Amino acid sequence: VPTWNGFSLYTDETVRNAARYAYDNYLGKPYTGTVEATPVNFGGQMVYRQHHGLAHTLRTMAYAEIIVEEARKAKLRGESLKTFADGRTLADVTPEELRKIMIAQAFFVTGRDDEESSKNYEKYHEQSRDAFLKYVEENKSTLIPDVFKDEKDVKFYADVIEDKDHKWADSPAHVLVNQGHMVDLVRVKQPPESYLEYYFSQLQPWIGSTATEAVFATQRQFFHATYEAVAGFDSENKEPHLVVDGLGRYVIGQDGNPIRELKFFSQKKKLEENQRYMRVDEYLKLDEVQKRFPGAGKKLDGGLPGLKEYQYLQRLNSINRARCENDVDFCLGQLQTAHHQTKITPIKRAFQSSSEKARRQPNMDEIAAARIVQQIMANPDCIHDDHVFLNGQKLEEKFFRDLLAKCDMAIVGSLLNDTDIRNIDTLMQHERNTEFHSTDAKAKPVKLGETWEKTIRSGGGVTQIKHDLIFLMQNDAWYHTRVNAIAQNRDKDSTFKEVLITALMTPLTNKSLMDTSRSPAPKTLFRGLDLSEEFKNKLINQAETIIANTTEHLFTDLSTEAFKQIKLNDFSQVSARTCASTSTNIEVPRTIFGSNTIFEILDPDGLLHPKQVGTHVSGSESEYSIYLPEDVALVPIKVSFDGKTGKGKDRHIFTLVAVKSPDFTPRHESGYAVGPLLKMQTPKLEEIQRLVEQAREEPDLERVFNLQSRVARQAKFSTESGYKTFLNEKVAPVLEQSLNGLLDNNVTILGKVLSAFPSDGQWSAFNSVEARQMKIQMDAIKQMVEKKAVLEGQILPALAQCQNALEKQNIAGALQALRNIPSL
Amino acid sequence: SVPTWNGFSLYTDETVRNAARYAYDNYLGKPYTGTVEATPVNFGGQMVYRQHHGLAHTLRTMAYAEIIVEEARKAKLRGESLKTFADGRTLADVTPEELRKIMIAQAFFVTGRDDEESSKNYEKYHEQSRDAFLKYVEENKSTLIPDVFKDEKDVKFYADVIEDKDHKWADSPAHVLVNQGHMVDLVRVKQPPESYLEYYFSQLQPWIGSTATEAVFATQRQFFHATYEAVAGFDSENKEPHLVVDGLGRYVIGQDGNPIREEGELKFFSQKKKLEENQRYMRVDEYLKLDEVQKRFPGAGKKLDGGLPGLKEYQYLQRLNSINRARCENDVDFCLGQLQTAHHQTKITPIKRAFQSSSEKARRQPNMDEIAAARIVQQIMANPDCIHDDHVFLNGQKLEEKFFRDLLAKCDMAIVGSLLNDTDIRNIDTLMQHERNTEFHSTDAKAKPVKLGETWEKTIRSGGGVTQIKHDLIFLMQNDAWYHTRVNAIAQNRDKDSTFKEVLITALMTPLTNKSLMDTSRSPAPKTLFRGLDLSEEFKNKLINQAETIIANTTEHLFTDLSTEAFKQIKLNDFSQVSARTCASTSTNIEVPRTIFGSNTIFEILDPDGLLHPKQVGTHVSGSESEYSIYLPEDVALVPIKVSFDGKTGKGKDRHIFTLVAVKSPDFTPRHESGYAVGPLLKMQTPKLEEIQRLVEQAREEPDLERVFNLQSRVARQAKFSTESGYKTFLNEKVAPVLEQSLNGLLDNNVTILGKVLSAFPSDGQWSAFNSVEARQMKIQMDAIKQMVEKKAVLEGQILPALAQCQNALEKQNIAGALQALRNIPSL
Amino acid sequence: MQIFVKTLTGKTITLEVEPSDTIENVKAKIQDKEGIPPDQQALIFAGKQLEDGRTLSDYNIQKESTLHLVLRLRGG
Amino acid sequence: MQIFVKTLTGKTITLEVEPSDTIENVKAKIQDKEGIPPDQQALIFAGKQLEDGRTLSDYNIQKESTLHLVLRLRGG
Ligand SMILES: NC(=O)c1ccc[n+]([C@@H]2O[C@H](COP(=O)([O-])OP(=O)(O)OC[C@H]3O[C@@H](n4cnc5c(N)ncnc54)[C@H](O)[C@@H]3O)[C@@H](O)[C@H]2O)c1
Ligand SMILES: NC(=O)c1ccc[n+]([C@@H]2O[C@H](COP(=O)([O-])OP(=O)(O)OC[C@H]3O[C@@H](n4cnc5c(N)ncnc54)[C@H](O)[C@@H]3O)[C@@H](O)[C@H]2O)c1
Ligand SMILES: Nc1ncnc2c1ncn2[C@@H]1O[C@H](COP(=O)(O)O)[C@@H](O)[C@H]1O
Ligand SMILES: Nc1ncnc2c1ncn2[C@@H]1O[C@H](COP(=O)(O)O)[C@@H](O)[C@H]1O
């Protein structure tokens, strides 16, 4: 199956001119014959040829187009289509060949003088051929050979129009023109089931059942778009079956079964007792019919859903009907909108729907990541070359690539504030000489922080900073190429600082865009890429597989297969994870940057939330940034060859539709960001470990001994009597006791030797130099002993009791351990 | 060139005392048959016939001979040059045998007196004294000749000395000793004192030297006190007239104002001589200030108190009239006892003058490191699992060999033993079990190794209670040489090739043995002990030299204190160490070291001031070793006062007896750096505070924020569907806000938020309104959320700030604010 | 040597240069000919954006080559 | 062969022995003649204490040598 070139009934100029000429000179011209020569009227506008006029012709052309589309899809799925003499299938019809087909179709009915069917068939198609060749001759310049290769080409298609010998199945041209006109009949004819089943019989061999179902479903959408009534279909209808070839009937007679040679019966032949015609329902319940028609047991509603019978009939007599029958551009517009819609409704039929168009609210790890980015932003001193060191925890390259890979960085950006924006300048300071590397290895390294201050940053308030950041992204390829490559995890040889900067800047950039964009979101954007030939070929295969397994249907819903192949072949991630650059003007990616791949992104349901980049005066890039929501897929609906680049490479345009569904959500294990944040919130508690460090200080016994030795020198010869009775009995024993108390750290000894220390008035009894000197040293020893008995006898038992209450869930007793301290 | 004395003494030789007894029995104690002062007198009711020239006087003269020879020998050992006789000998060369003969002669020197006549009957009285001597020799010819006197011509030599025919008072050592022995006594009688003291000093001084002479006359005044004789003063500034004693004359100062000197030479003046007008006598004050007298007499400018120090003049006179005076004058044994005690004290008082004094006889109180060492010993004892082969590992510290050798070297292990208890004693059995096959080695290399613990269990230990253990330990010490020789060598830091375990056992069991001894000994401390040693000839001779230097540089004095030289020589030559640092074995019976063990060295250790604190070892039945153990105090030295040659051992080597006196002084204290034991104990007691560090480990545990966020989703999905009327308006109204606020509080660590959402959690009664399975499920979940919030609000909002402020208040020494921080915690 | 810079608005602007010229030079040229402030100019050749300071020869833009210029401004 | 053990109390004990006699045995002989239980006996020769188990010839005690005997008991 070859790749199409984007040729379409709705955009080719030659085919539209052919339709105008056919309309101008024939259709819409009062019938010169008898039968239904009388015009009819819609909303005040007159249509001369109601049934075989312009809308019918344009529909025939549209049917040929979708028949080729669905034929190609079916050959790509592996179906075996009916072959012609060449061995070709309808799938092998080329764009040029189809243009010739449709041009013939435009004249296929122009040769009618009235609406007579039974007779005048030969004559009317002779007149159609004469019209066709007149048109060819009068535009021979334009037409030949560019459209038609030569005069014999023209006679081939003229021969198909003449239809002398009814060679309906000779070639693709014969099949497409005749069955193109045939499919339109499936409107007027009652009863519906019989006719729909018959026309279905005749199309089915050439394109397959799936394709035929898609053709007739699209057909009813075309009827709606050109204001033609749409019948119902009832598998259980009890009217009699109509044998379409010969307008006959089937019977059963005596024998319970139906009469078989099935035996054809004319309607004029009247037969025996208790013999009756076969009904519609029993015809559709025969096995031969079920095996070739999936209509059994099914029913379809007539009219339009949501429309009252009065409202539907009112819409059918609108002036838009006459606009369709008289205005080529208007009718082609209607058909084009229907055709485009039939490529989207299967896609959304295949996945669960969502009523919320906005991004979800944050999950726990996005909140934690937002906090970690605010803290890094707040203190850039924590950024080293190797790793980030914040509140005693160490985050390396892997952690930040995990944030870029698992967090919605836009949702993260929605949790940052104007202070984080303002701190961009400080972080830049700190990274004044950090070198960024473009992904172009011939580009010089460019310091970051420096350049930011030198060339980018322009003063002002926070909004000005936001614009400056957005400008850095829009303008500095040495920055945005590294940043995008890292965010999408497709970078080579990046420094840690580059990874970190990307991790910090992606959410902050998203915040700047969200806060500053004022535009209502455009619904068509274009994104250009320069891909390798192999990668592009992979994307083409995946897109063609998705498209070939997305089909409309009447009776047999294959949504499950569309779901399966879309998840096998999705390439949404090529536009994900980063602030992706797009333009509303296809010429930005096609002509200015020379991309060989162009994504035409369609967002009719407004799910991409693009945001405006810079200003969009004439001559600007008309740039918007997309940060693809986690649950939106960009599903391909068309792949077209667009010519070649300035460098000679092939260029393709992928048309993608944004689709939001819980089915597209990724599954990520939680905790990657909450954990490190929790490690950061654990207290240093250094006053406690210095309480422990002072709780392990050895007592200064030397001081103690010194005082008792001095007490000894002065406690042996003092001519004054009471100073020595005081010295031996009241001071030396306290130094005894105390020295042993400190030595064994027995708190019982110390707690009561406290009471044995002499008072200041006891010491004041002696006014000598050494007596006061001693009282000061005794006081210091008393402070030592007391603090020691207080620590090991009161405070640390309290802290142990409190702790033991904490491991036992007894919080109130834990506080009681602190407040109800027992005295010594 | 001084031979070692053999222990001969006036106070222990039997021959000399027999001669004194005979002299008294026959002549001295008999009444005077002459005229002048023939009348007997009375002391306390007892009669003395010869008061001035009786028994006490004779015994004193002999005592003077002994001290004159002693000080002569000391003076030649110091390097002094003494006056020689014709043969070339000095008084220092007098032998014990010769001194015995001299003393026997001295005993009769006055027996021939008929009364106290001086000027008239000198020839007759000395002829009668000579006859008394020869009578005694004749009646005892059997015992005395030839063993004491070699023949009759020897005897006639000493009889000739007694006769004193030709006043040849300086012909021989016998002449000098007998005449000046009798002369030295002359002192008590004569006033003025200074003149007499100077003259006798001048006649002894050439023969023994000034140092020696000073020692003689000082000891002399001590003998006077011990025999109840009055002691005069001495005043260099006395203004009495000088008495020229040689001739009982005068020196005169004329009108001109100078002493009358001959053609120079002071010339003698009779006291009867006519005196020129305004001519005057030389006073004592002027005599002692002449240059010739100062060069030969150090009494100038000095003064001495009379009587006894500490005694009132009235009680001094009361003491002089005691009955003990008559005992001295009539009882040979009593008087020799008095003199012996005085003589012995004059060898101690110089020693104690040379060093700082000490008032307390007890061991000092424990220092820091002894207390710590005692604790480490109790801990090793209670938990012997800590003893390895190279070290002890106790409470996270590693004590190696030298730590325990440091304890052995720097601690008074007796003081340490005083800090142990009966359960450490009881724990000896456990220690011995742990050391069942630890092998001890005698210092005798011909002995085989013994296993310590095994021998303890199978041979030494006898059951019973603690006291029995103490006795068993003491018995191990007393009885097992493979143990005590190693232990002693290690304790004294003189061991070769000891194992770590031998050192440790020594360090542990020296204090434990001391405790056993102090706890069990009851005997009163003996004041003479004997310790025997088998020393090499090199080492013994070194000790002999050191002791003789010390003794020769310890002298009594009157005017010239040489204490500084005694201090210098004692500190150069002290060998107290060879008796230190261990539980040293001694006996009260000299025959134990001399005869049972055959020691060639015997220390006669004397402890008159009770400073050694010996303890009884074993039993003291007859035939036992009468053993006591001494652990020498750090500040007590055993100072030598005498060295005697005592004969030969059973193996033929020379045996010597060193007499040592224990002397306590701060000067003998050693200086040791503190901390050798205190340090490791303090490092053992640094507290492991695991309950505190698990309080902080609980303070750093992360809250389950994912659980609160998931719970918000469950409140939401359970909120979408109603159940109770109303239950989901309750969820939207009262629970989802609390979960939001809790999450926001936990996202930050704002304790204000968590503290107020704590009050915002709905009550149990509000939840009692709903009875669904999901309602009760959710109240369980909400309880868990509230517990989470509560632990963070209490720790971060109340407890941890309280501990931070408490810490800050103690780090500013504000203990009152420190407790204030814990008990004055405000509620949220 | 002469080169042409083409715009999105359609006009084709012709410039006189030689390879030793920088791009500072080229946007100054374009300003003199069209009144286009140089900080608004973004110049692209064969898909790559050209940087101030570096010369025309460095990017191998040779005679008769076509550069593309787009206006690029800060928002607000 | 005969040896004499001399005591502190003055007595001289004469024993007839043989060089291969142990010291246990010698103390047993002393017990038989003077009634002194061997557990109280401490025998010394030339300054050295003799140990049970070893023979008289082991200590080189020969004819008419003199040993010394002291009583040695535990306290209490
Ligand atoms: N349509 C557009 O691409 C477009 C539109 C308007 C403005 N711009 C401007 O272009 C610059 C940004 O250019 P950009 O967005 O083309 O660069 P961006 O970083 O996507 O990367 C450009 C090139 O990187 C490679 N690349 C990108 N994604 C890849 C993937 N998923 N797998 C493999 N290769 C991949 C391709 O070569 C791609 O052309 C800015 O000046 C921007 O304003 C571009
Ligand atoms: N030594 C005695 O007078 C004495 C008294 C009573 C009992 N004992 C008994 O003797 C045994 C104890 O014997 P000990 O006290 O001779 O053992 P010890 O360990 O004190 O000494 C044994 C030998 O070591 C040498 N020695 C000791 N100290 C020395 C030193 N400082 N420098 C050089 N050599 C030194 C000497 O040869 C000494 O005789 C026990 O049975 C004990 O009951 C001995
Ligand atoms: N089975 C068929 N296959 C192809 N074309 C058909 C078929 N039936 C009808 N047509 C086309 O429709 C016209 C027939 O209409 P009718 O004559 O009403 O059957 C013919 O002109 C054919 O062009
Ligand atoms: N200068 C002296 N040298 C030696 N002996 C003396 C001296 N003076 C006195 N004596 C002794 O004392 C006795 C004399 O007593 P008197 O005559 O009072 O001096 C004499 O026998 C001597 O034995």
Q: Are B535 and B578 in contact (CB under 8 A)?
A: no
Q: Is A60 in the pocket of ligand 3 (CB under 6 A)?
A: no
CA distance A457 to chain C (A): 11
CA B568 to chain centre: 18
Among candidate residues B198, B233, B268, the one where a domain is terminated: B233
Q: How far apart are CA B498 and CA B483, in angstroms?
A: 12
Q: Within this chain, do residues A730 and A659 fall inside the same structural domain, yes or no?
A: no
Looking at residue A401, its amino acid is: R
**Which residue(s) pair with B636 in the sheet?**
B664
What are the residue boundaries of the structural domains of chain D, listed by start? 1-76
CA A222 to chain centre: 30
Using a 10 angstrom Cβ sphere, with 0-12 exposed, 13-18 middle and 19 or more buried, the burial of residue B773 is exposed
Q: Within this chain, do residues A690 and A628 fall inside the same structural domain, yes or no?
A: no
3-state secondary structure of D15: strand
CB of A621 within 8 Å of a chain C CB? The answer is: yes
The enclosing H or E element of A637 equals strand A632-644
Tokens for C20, please give them. Answer: 């030793």
Q: Are B627 and B614 in contact (CB under 8 A)?
A: no
Could you report how far apart the first and last alpha carbons of chain A are, in Å? Answer: 98
3-state secondary structure of A415: coil
Cβ contact (<8 Å) for C74 and A647? no
Tokens for C39, please give them. Answer: 């900080």
Q: Which residues of A49-62 are buried (b: 16+ CB within 10 A; e: fewer)?
A: bbbbbbbbbbbbbb
Q: What is the DSSP string of A71-118?
A: HHHHHHHT--PPP-TTS--GGG--HHHHHHHHHHHHHTTTT-SSS--S
Among candidate residues A485, A516, A547, the one where a domain is terminated: A516
Nearest to D17 by CA among D75, D59, D48: D59
Q: How far apart are CA A135 and CA A105, in angstroms?
A: 13
The four Cα atoms A304, A306, A310, A312 give a dihedral, to 10 degrees, of: -30
Nearest to D15 by CA among D76, D71, D46, D56: D56
Tokens for B80, please give them. Answer: 């002094």
Q: Are A504 and A492 in contact (CB under 8 A)?
A: no
The number of domains in chain A is 4
The answer to whether position A480 is within a domain reads yes
Q: Are B527 and B607 in contact (CB under 8 A)?
A: yes
Peptide bond between residue A145 and the one before it cis (omega within 30 degrees of 0): yes
A177 Cα–ligand 3 center, Å: 10
Q: Are A100 and A173 in contact (CB under 8 A)?
A: yes
Cβ contact (<8 Å) for A674 and B706? yes
Cβ contact (<8 Å) for C71 and A619? yes
Q: Are B560 and B353 in contact (CB under 8 A)?
A: no
Resolution as reported, in Å? 2.8
Rg of the Cα atoms in chain C:
12
Tokens for D75, please give them. Answer: 């306290």
The beta strand positions in B636-717, using DSSP E, are: 636-648, 654-664
Cβ contact (<8 Å) for C46 and A471? no
Looking at residue A353, its amino acid is: S
CA B511 to chain centre: 19
In the block, tokens 């001193």 appear at: A381
Chains in contact with C, counting 3 or more C-beta pairs less than 8 Å apart as contact: A
The answer to whether position A345 is within a domain reads no
Do B and C make contact, counting contact as 3+ CB pairs within 8 angstroms? no
Ligand with minimal distance to B493 CA: 2
In eight-state DSSP terms, residue B192 is S
Q: Are D71 and B624 in contact (CB under 8 A)?
A: yes
Cα-based distances in Å from A118 to A56, A181, A544, B438: 20, 17, 45, 136
Q: Within this chain, do residues A50 and A141 fall inside the same structural domain, yes or no?
A: yes
CB of B86 within 8 Å of a chain D CB? The answer is: no
Which technique was used to obtain these atomic coordinates? Answer: X-ray
Q: Are A815 and B799 in contact (CB under 8 A)?
A: yes
Nearest to B434 by CA among B389, B477, B470: B389
Q: What is the DSSP string of B469-486?
A: HHHHHHHHHHH-HHHHHH
Q: What value, to the nearest 5°, has the Cα angle with vertex B653 and ends B650 and B659?
A: 95
Q: Domain containing A80: what range?
A: 13-190+208-229+322-326
- Ligand 1 neighbours, Cβ below 6 Å, are A 474, 480-481, 484, 488, 490, 526-530, 574, 581-583, 588-589, 593, 621, 623
Nearest to B679 by CA among B371, B366, B380: B371
Nearest to A434 by CA among A452, A447, A443: A447
Q: Are A560 and A568 in contact (CB under 8 A)?
A: no
Q: Is B531 in the pocket of ligand 2 (CB under 6 A)?
A: yes
Q: Which residues of B touch D75 (CB under 8 A)?
A: 470-471, 474-475, 520, 616-619
Residues 6 or more apart whose Cβ sits within 8 Å of residue B321: B43, B44
- The percent helix, strand, coil of chain B (3-state, each to 5) is 55, 10, 35
Q: Are strands A597-602 and A650-660 parallel, antiparallel or unpaired?
A: parallel
Do C and D make contact, counting contact as 3+ CB pairs within 8 angstroms? no
**Which residue(s) pair with B530 in the sheet?**
B587, B604
Q: Within this chain, do residues B37 and B182 fall inside the same structural domain, yes or no?
A: yes
Q: Which residues of D26-49 are buried (b: 16+ CB within 10 A; e: fewer)?
A: bbebbeeeeebebebbbbbbbbeb
Q: Are B137 and B155 in contact (CB under 8 A)?
A: yes
Q: Within this chain, do residues A602 and A692 fall inside the same structural domain, yes or no?
A: no
Using a 10 angstrom Cβ sphere, with 0-12 exposed, 13-18 middle and 19 or more buried, the burial of residue B592 is buried
- Give the count of Cβ contacts less than 8 A between chain B and D: 67
Q: Which of D8, D9, D72 minimises the CB distance to B478?
A: D72
CB of B472 within 8 Å of a chain D CB? The answer is: yes
Q: Are strands C48-49 and D41-45 parallel, antiparallel or unpaired?
A: unpaired
Using a 10 angstrom Cβ sphere, with 0-12 exposed, 13-18 middle and 19 or more buried, the burial of residue A342 is buried
The phi, psi pair for A206, rounded to 5°, reads -85, -25
Q: How far apart are CA B215 and CA B228, in angstroms?
A: 20
Q: Are B667 and B353 in contact (CB under 8 A)?
A: no
Q: How many helices (H) and strands (E) does chain C have?
A: 1, 5
Looking at residue B47, its amino acid is: M
Q: Which residues of B touch A691 (CB under 8 A)?
A: 692, 803, 806-807, 810
Using a 10 angstrom Cβ sphere, with 0-12 exposed, 13-18 middle and 19 or more buried, the burial of residue B226 is buried
Ligand with minimal distance to A535 CA: 1
Tokens for A403, please give them. Answer: 């944030």
3-state secondary structure of A235: coil
Tokens for B470, please give them. Answer: 């103490």
Q: What is the DSSP string of B250-276?
A: B-EE-SSSSB-EE--EE--B-SSS---
Q: How far apart are CA B269 and CA B248, in angstroms?
A: 9
Nearest to A371 by CA among A670, A676, A668, A629: A676
Q: How far apart are CA D29 and CA D13, in angstroms?
A: 10
In the block, tokens 């966020």 appear at: B709
Among candidate residues A516, A532, A564, the one where a domain is terminated: A516
Cβ contact (<8 Å) for B700 and A685? yes
Q: Within this chain, do residues A597 and A699 fall inside the same structural domain, yes or no?
A: no
Q: Are strands B584-587 and B627-630 parallel, antiparallel or unpaired?
A: antiparallel
Residues 6 or more apart whose Cβ sits within 8 Å of residue D34: D11, D13
Do D and A make contact, counting contact as 3+ CB pairs within 8 angstroms? no
Q: How far apart are CA A18 and CA B816, in angstroms?
A: 107
Q: Are B809 and B820 in contact (CB under 8 A)?
A: yes
The answer to whether position A275 is within a domain reads no
CB of B376 within 8 Å of a chain A CB? The answer is: no
Q: How far apart are CA A129 and CA A162, in angstroms?
A: 5
The beta strand positions in B609-717, using DSSP E, are: 615-616, 627-630, 636-648, 654-664
Q: What ligand 2 atom has the least distance to the C-alpha of B485?
A: 19
Q: How far apart are CA B496 and CA A382, in angstroms?
A: 65
Q: Are D16 and D1 in contact (CB under 8 A)?
A: yes
The enclosing H or E element of A652 equals strand A650-660
Q: Are D67 and D3 in contact (CB under 8 A)?
A: yes
Number of residues assigned to chain B: 828
Q: How far apart are CA B481 and CA B487, in angstroms?
A: 9
Chains in contact with D, counting 3 or more C-beta pairs less than 8 Å apart as contact: B
The answer to whether position A740 is within a domain reads yes
The beta strand positions in B27-185, using DSSP E, are: 41-43, 46-48
**Which residue(s) pair with A612 in the sheet?**
A624
Q: Are B144 and B128 in contact (CB under 8 A)?
A: no
**Which residue(s) pair with B664 in the sheet?**
B636
